[PDB]
Amino acid sequence: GCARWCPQDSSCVNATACRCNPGFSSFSEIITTPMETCDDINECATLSKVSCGKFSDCWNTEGSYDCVCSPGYEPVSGAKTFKNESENTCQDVDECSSGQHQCDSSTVCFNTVGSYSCRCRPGWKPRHGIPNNQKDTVCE
Ligand SMILES: C[As](C)(=O)[O-]
Ligand SMILES: [Ca+2]
Ligand SMILES: [Ca+2]
């Protein structure tokens, strides 16, 4: 059988009951009424569950979730999206060597984990207001 009144995001279990689809939850384990709702589980809140690993972030979605390397980090496996630690290959991006940085020609790019900084070349001095060791740094 298959109850046809099954609420959204749930699938029939028999002729008089339904079950929330994987990724959703309901108040009762078994839906026996069309008034019951199947709500999205936030996999990123349960701090209990394992992590995405280092340099990553958990992003919740309606019906699922995704792990992504944080800004300043990129996956060596080309896999922009992953599910667990084991799939984590987020390494830091070297904006200086990759020439992706945007330091004033008057400065020298210095790479850091997750970011990067522009420093004053020796014998040079920072312009006014703006300080050194920064992405907006400028020297004269
Ligand atoms: C993509 As949907 C509205 O079936 O959760
Ligand atoms: Ca979710
Ligand atoms: Ca970096």
Side-chain angles (χ1 to χ4, degrees):
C2 195
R4 24 219 134 199
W5 46 261
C6 288
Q8 184 206 327
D9 288 317
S10 95
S11 287
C12 79
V13 135
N14 58 39
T16 44
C18 320
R19 236 187 162 82
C20 279
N21 285 338
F24 301 90
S25 95
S26 56
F27 193 81
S28 350
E29 140 163 36
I30 304 296
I31 298 186
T32 65
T33 231
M35 299 85 79
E36 284 159 280
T37 63
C38 275
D39 304 286
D40 156 77
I41 288 169
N42 185 343
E43 291 94 346
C44 303
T46 323
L47 280 327
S48 307
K49 142 246 199 240
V50 120
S51 225
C52 292
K54 50 175 188 20
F55 313 151
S56 82
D57 296 282
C58 190
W59 281 84
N60 185 50
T61 61
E62 277 263 279
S64 210
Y65 80 89
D66 287 289
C67 293
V68 287
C69 305
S70 324
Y73 307 85
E74 254 151 40
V76 168
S77 57
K80 51 178 262 128
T81 273
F82 60 97
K83 287 320 217 271
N84 63 250
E85 254 195 336
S86 82
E87 310 165 328
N88 187 330
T89 71
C90 304
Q91 230 58 264
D92 154 82
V93 154
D94 190 321
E95 293 87 348
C96 311
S97 316
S98 70
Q100 276 169 56
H101 69 84
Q102 298 167 347
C103 295
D104 184 64
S105 3
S106 84
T107 85
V108 66
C109 182
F110 183 88
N111 182 55
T112 76
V113 219
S115 208
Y116 78 82
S117 58
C118 313
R119 276 157 192 215
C120 280
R121 8 243 287 308
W124 280 68
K125 279 90 238 193
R127 246 205 84 57
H128 186 245
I130 27 230
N132 195 26
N133 218 39
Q134 256 209 203
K135 298 213 210 170
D136 53 24
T137 302
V138 178
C139 324
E140 8 165 36

